Amino acid sequence: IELSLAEALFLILFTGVISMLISRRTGISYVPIFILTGLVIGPLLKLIPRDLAHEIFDFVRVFGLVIILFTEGHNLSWRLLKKNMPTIVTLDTIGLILTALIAGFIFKVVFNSSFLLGFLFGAIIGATDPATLIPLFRQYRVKQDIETVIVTESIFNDPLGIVLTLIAISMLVPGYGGGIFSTLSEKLGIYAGGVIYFLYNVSVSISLGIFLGILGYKFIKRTGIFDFPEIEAFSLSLAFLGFFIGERLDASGYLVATVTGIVLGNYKLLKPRENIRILKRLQRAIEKEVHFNDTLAALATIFIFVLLGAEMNLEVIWSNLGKGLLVALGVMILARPLATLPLLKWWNFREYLFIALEGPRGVVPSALASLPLSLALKYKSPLLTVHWGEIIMATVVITVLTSVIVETLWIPILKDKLDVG
Amino acid sequence: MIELSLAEALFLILFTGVISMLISRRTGISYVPIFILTGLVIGPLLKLIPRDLAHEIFDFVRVFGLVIILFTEGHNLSWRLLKKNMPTIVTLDTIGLILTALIAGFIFKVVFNSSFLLGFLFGAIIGATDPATLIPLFRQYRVKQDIETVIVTESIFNDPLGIVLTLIAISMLVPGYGGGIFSTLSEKLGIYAGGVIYFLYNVSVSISLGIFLGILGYKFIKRTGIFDFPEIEAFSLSLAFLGFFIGERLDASGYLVATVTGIVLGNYKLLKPRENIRILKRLQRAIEKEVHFNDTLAALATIFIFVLLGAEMNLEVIWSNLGKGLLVALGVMILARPLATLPLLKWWNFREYLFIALEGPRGVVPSALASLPLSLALKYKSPLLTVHWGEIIMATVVITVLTSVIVETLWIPILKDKLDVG
Ligand SMILES: CCCCCCCCCCCCCCCCCCCC(=O)O[C@H](COC(=O)CCCCCCCCCCCCCC)COP(=O)(O)OCCN
Ligand SMILES: CCCCCCCCO[C@@H]1O[C@H](CO)[C@@H](O)[C@H](O)[C@H]1O
């Protein structure tokens, strides 16, 4: 009486729900709880096969990522962005890159891998998910501007961490470069081609995202889309429209969708103020939309973390426990602050250090974690090996768990030393 | 016709569907023929959605969509109004349904040479009703509250049972679904008596279990204080599907379990007579948000169902038996439905009865079950049902849906004028 695929998916959902409940009730972060649940229903009870978790992940990756990043777009205020523009821009143009690179050198050293493979690991481990941190920021009443900068940086790095990961793989394997990557690389080498392609991708993604967000907003006003179930379905369709159009012209559809989310989140700012009645109407609409889509992003998160927990291979992670652990603490202590370094050039050091140290790794790399493995199994290419895929995945899991728990636990005392003085 | 990705296909269905939804609400036209026409456009007309792919999508949207749609439907039922018109409701969902399916089987078998089981399958498919496209005209013309309650509740119970009957007709024609309680009972007391007793069994067990998991659900939520986003939505979805799978493992329609669960959750006030208002407030709000989510999902499911149905038909078979199918549809509307609706017309004035009869078209559930016999034919090679006959059934169902919906949504003012002088 083994579980069918439907009962399997549902098992993931239900178990994830219970895990969520006990997580909230107890006060423990949802990340290691969801991972734990994964291992429980996974390799332990063998209720869910890892080789199936691969494919379920092959859907939940694209879907969940797009919807989650889109939902993240809404929680961004353009005002606070432009007010603290340089800091954020540095955090999402330099700090990310340097984090990924140092992390890559670390990986290369610890596992004797290539620096390109390490760069893949770093690109995966680049983005940050502080959604695990926020409740403590609130209940300990940390600086509002700090929370602003951190959260904003995350919202921006989540899709950037992806396109970074897509770069490294595109370098390792020329499979489905799209055309832009292929052309730009064949004209200006692999690395420089990667740089200019990064610039291109970012440019077109931001542009198209803003464009589609605005046009969608205006479309809503014109056609009058404020009532159930039009607003939800339309907004969803808009997000995935941005994603598919973006990916169609070789741009990060994730980033596009995120940007669209930012636009809709800042609908009150872009076009002329209407009468308070209309503003309230649009407000209600956006509230409904946000509700539905954020519910979807919640489910998606649950599935991502649980699947990851049920997909890992115990023997591989144990044979490299210490190694990947020191890679984790290595990137938490050495990489992140080193990359953060130019912050104190425009910030106070006591601020800069907290901002550096605090940022952990979360959902996005957890989704990207199995990608190199699955891609290795499928494409079956010599450059990246299946074993190294297992290595990557294991490491990513380790640094995710360790970063999350260490940040979550070391945050209280760290305020006392940085607030009081 | 450049090949799309699977994801691009799904998204295309979504986008086009939403566009057609907007257009539907704006123009005032029923969403059903707009959706189906849309699917037809992006389907065989443009070949952006290969029919094979359509089958593959519909094999998922069937399960997931139907479950969530029905579970959503459960919420909109009042036990009070049920008590108010209990015998009528029970009659319609039980007797009138079976009779409808049977007569439809007769007609279907008449139009072209077939087994009576094929026709019975056809009737069991279109057994359920969907007045969702009628309500905007009901409140528009201030129609009697009682009859609306009757029709709505009727459809609410007809949607799962219609599948159960469809589950029955399938169980006979295929050896796969055979092995089970139904096989035992039918072999024991003949196909007829066995069918009836398995009907009673499935209904009873599914209902009782749905009530059980419903109460257990409400009590659980009550104890662990599930009100804050997003615990409630996730837990609700989990609950509905739990009921589904558990119910299905006991050889009973899990859909019916989902519906009953939805009924239980819908009538939260009725469970505890006295409870301090605060609790009822938080509960009402949480339930409301949950309803928003699950109903949005239900809408998406509806769209996908109708559009997919639109893209899954082939104009060759459709045209080939065009007149035939039309005769079937008209036969069902004009003859079958009222003939099956007569039993408890004793409680209702003849004009009102003729109204109830002449109303109640076929929508979502038959649209989902339309391609079911074809898929099974393509997968299980029955000596009873063929692929082409699956095509005949799906086509006939499509025509039935279009005709019934369009007419019964369009003729309502005139009909009201006939029974209520105007
Ligand atoms: C994680 C993000 C959360 C939000 C996502 C949307 C909400 C879903 C949340 C998770 C739901 C948990 C509950 C599990 C649902 C049960 C799924 C049933 C799957 C199933 O059995 O499919 C089988 C085949 O699948 C196949 O053939 C594969 C078909 C491939 C296309 C599937 C695409 C699905 C997209 C649906 C989107 C529309 C829904 C509204 C969002 C059917 O096989 P059978 O038994 O019928 O075979 C015999 C007939 N001859
Ligand atoms: C079923 C037809 C109505 C569907 C829309 C459901 C309306 C739910 O409205 C809900 O009200 C809550 C009250 O705080 C808000 O917090 C939620 O954001 C909002 O979605």
Numbering used by the authors:
A (entry chain B): 2 to 422
B (entry chain A): 1 to 422
The authors write:
H5 and H12 in the 6-helix bundle are discontinuous. dimer indicates clusters of charged residues on both sides of the membrane. transported by PaNhaP, K+ is not. structure thus serves as an excellent model for the membrane part of NHE1.
Six ion bridges that lock the two protomers together at pH 8 break at pH 4.
